[PDB]
Amino acid sequence: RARSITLGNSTITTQECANVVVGYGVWPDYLKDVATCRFYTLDSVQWQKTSPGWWWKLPDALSNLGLFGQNMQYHYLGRTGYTVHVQCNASKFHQGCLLVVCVPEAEMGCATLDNTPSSAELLGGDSAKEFADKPVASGSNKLVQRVVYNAGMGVGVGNLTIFPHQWINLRTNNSATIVMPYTNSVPMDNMFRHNNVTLMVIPFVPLDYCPGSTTYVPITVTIAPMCAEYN
Amino acid sequence: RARSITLGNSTITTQECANVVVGYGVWPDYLKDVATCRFYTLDSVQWQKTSPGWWWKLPDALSNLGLFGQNMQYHYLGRTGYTVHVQCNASKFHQGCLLVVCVPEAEMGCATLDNTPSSAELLGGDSAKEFADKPVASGSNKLVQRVVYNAGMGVGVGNLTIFPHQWINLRTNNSATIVMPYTNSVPMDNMFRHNNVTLMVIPFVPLDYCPGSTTYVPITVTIAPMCAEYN
Amino acid sequence: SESTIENFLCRSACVYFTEYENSGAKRYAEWVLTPRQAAQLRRKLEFFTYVRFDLELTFVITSTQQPSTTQNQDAQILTHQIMYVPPGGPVPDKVDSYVWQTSTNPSVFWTEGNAPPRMSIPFLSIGNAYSNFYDGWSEFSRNGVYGINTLNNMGTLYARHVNAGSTGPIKSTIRIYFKPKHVKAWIPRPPRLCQYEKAKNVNFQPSGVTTTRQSITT
Amino acid sequence: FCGSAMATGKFLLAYSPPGAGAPTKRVDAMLGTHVVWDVGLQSSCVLCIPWGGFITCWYQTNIVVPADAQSSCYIMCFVSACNDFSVRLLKDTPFIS
């Protein structure tokens, strides 16, 4: 069966057993603007037979979107929880697996060992930056190392499940819901200068379908900031 | 002695005995956004030996000013009280009198009997429109009849004290504070389409000073919307 | 009972090697305190995102004579000074500078032939934890290096020979031991698969997931 | 939604209040009052409108169907009075001739 969840004016449709995985046993709380608590539904990304992956920076993902964008603009510092929902609607004749994971402080490596990458290449605003299968060339470019079996951070992609994750298997599961607490050494930090968490979605087992099916599966990502306060 | 009044972040300096005149025995109340309750201090206008008068439309006066301007923009309809403060700082060797009055639904006449006036000529935004001594020419112009002894509405200027007024005599008084309730036939009305109250300031007894004094007296007007609600 | 983060991150590990001579082109040592030079300790610390700890700096200063052709050399006991610079402290531009006398920098004097000198440092970070992995730009307006937050600064260390021992040349070495104390960790993260390249950042060369075999059934 | 059971997708039902004109892009429709309707789970969506405004529907995702199922579907829309409803001043109908 289906159910409706309302925050402010937006509404989302989810199953009865959603199987939420809390971040670290902690639910987002104020440090001890309610109008910013809505479901900021981002765009859908077509999952294909060869798609390596995607990754979003939650603070940046909502930099241009309405009230959250206006607030993080004039206001200095602040903190924010998150409730990322990844919904992946596919038929019964499709097959495949996804690893939905929120990585805190994900520093990404640069293709040229000598220098760090550029801001535009690292942050994808209002769109999703995607990985790559083959290794990135090492020239004189400030590009980001987008190899998927290393995830960019430099660590083997297999053990990326230490972080709060959840698996979407198109055989049984259909969606994942990850609650993320505000994790930072500093009580409050400038949202624009520093991004605290990175949402990563990786297709371990590739999509596959018989000829005469939909050529792609439209993953859909919805962010809802919980307990946002500013100074 | 002097005193300080704080609303939000702005602060005003007024005497101990301010002699407030409530609108019609009623204090502004909600119909049965707090961030819009501040002292929106407009510009100062130099009062000279020949200045006929000035007039402001409160809704329009605050159309470009920050939060009030942004709110009355997207929001449809709404209601708002007011607390107009007119401060006129002049020496002891100056002399003169002012009639500070808030006129509800002040419809203004047009110089050409045949047609109504234009919007730009009627409404002065972020500035104060001023009257004139001699009669306005009757041609083919959509100008407003700015004669001061008629005030524009078409009535003898003397009996303009029926409306909530207050007199500033530079001999004893120095300022006036007029509280204005929301007066409208309709519970809520579009602030941009219709202006409910007009603030009028008229110098009955002219300014006069000996040679070697300040050539002008800088009147200062401060608006503070009380109990503003929107739909 | 043994795998606690204390017993896993409380081992004395050498982190520096350098030499300074009583007379010569190099007459003093300098090393900004960092736990990134030693790969063995860097890889152990990169298990956790936020880490907070105290230090126990213990030095080992040894002196050796040099191949010189001066005669009638009579040596006198050598005394070494080790000036710890707190973050934002003045740094000696030269060996015989005046900064070696500031009462703020806590220098420890040592005479050869005693128990090696040791001093401790508390948590100096203005923030609430040292952050191994920063995902931003240090400069507030950006146009600053990526992942280089200055919150982890731990100061600099300077060492010199207070008195020249003999007319003949003497060259001394100093090994700095790092011992984190009262360690705390937060947010566990996966072990670094690829080998380190630059101590400055996390840049790396892509590496395979593991060692390969003949067949899957073998 | 009157489509095959296999057919799945998402829709953005956005209602712009009176003063504002109809949205142009999907983002602008999302930033107002909206309801993300998932046909795969729920087959019928209900919208209660206060207080004229606009109603716009957008394709959040294209329809996904397994082989042997048609991808061209249809949607029907019912209208009804809700909660308080009053009518005053009886007049003649304009549909007579």
Swiss-Prot record, chain C:
Top-level taxonomic group: Viruses
Compartment list: Virion; Host cytoplasm
Coiled coil: none
Sequence intervals crossing the membrane: none
Function according to Swiss-Prot or TrEMBL: Forms an icosahedral capsid of pseudo T=3 symmetry with capsid proteins VP2 and VP3. The capsid is 300 Angstroms in diameter, composed of 60 copies of each capsid protein and enclosing the viral positive strand RNA genome. Capsid protein VP1 mainly forms the vertices of the capsid. Capsid protein VP1 interacts with host CD55 and CXADR to provide virion attachment to target host cells. This attachment induces virion internalization. Tyrosine kinases are probably involved in the entry process. After binding to its receptor, the capsid undergoes conformational changes.
Subunit structure: Interacts with capsid protein VP0, and capsid protein VP3 to form heterotrimeric protomers. Five protomers subsequently associate to form pentamers which serve as building blocks for the capsid. Interacts with capsid protein VP2, capsid protein VP3 and capsid protein VP4 following cleavage of capsid protein VP0. Interacts with host CD55. Interacts with host CXADR.
This protein's name: Capsid protein VP1
Species per Swiss-Prot/TrEMBL record: Coxsackievirus B3 (strain Nancy)
Residues of the full protein shown: 630 to 847 of 2185
